[PDB]
């Protein structure tokens, strides 16, 4: 899941980004700042990206000062990153809670939609059961009336057939 990016002709103003050493819970070298319009911005580096290799130097367990030395060691930098690996290190508490709220709201919106759709279908099935029993009773009443009507007509036909 690593991406490899290339920066050429690093000038005196430099990359236009900052690196920070991760804390104990999230160790590593992370991009903490990116200036708009900088070389790092033009090549797509973003705050929160983790740098895992630069110019063949492994950025795992590397201390801060050495990582800086490598990134200042050449005018051409090949930087391997895991994008957004440390994004939460540079998020405010409110931004992280807002994200958690939004994810919960999306699940809750679907749960409520399905709950009410299910309830409407329960009611609909109850209505079908009532109406089908009512119409079954109407049909059986009509059937037994017709059986009697047939016998009553046959009785009249017996009178009709007296000549």
């Amino acid at each position: 899941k690593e991406k490899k990016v290339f920066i050429s002709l690093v000038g005196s103003r430099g990359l236009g980004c900052s690196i920070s050493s991760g804390p104990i819970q999230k160790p590593g070298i992370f991009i903490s700042h990116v200036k708009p319009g900088s070389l790092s911005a033009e090549v797509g580096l973003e705050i929160g990206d983790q740098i895992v290799e630069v110019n063949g130097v492994d950025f795992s367990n590397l201390d801060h000062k050495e990582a800086v030395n490598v990134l200042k060691s050449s005018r051409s930098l090949t930087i391997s990153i895991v994008a957004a690996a440390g994004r939460e290190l540079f998020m405010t508490d409110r931004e992280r809670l807002a994200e958690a709220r939004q994810r919960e709201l999306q699940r809750q919106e679907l749960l409520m939609q399905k709950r009410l759709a299910m309830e409407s279908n329960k009611i609909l099935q109850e209505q079908q059961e009532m109406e089908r029993q009512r119409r079954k009773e109407i049909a059986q009443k009509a059937a037994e009336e017709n059986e009697r009507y047939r016998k009553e007509m046959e009785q009249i036909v017996e009178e009709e057939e007296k000549f």
Partner: peptide
């Protein structure tokens, strides 16, 4: 704050 260097 984290140990930070601008490049």
């Amino acid at each position: 704050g984290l140990d930070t260097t601008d490049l």
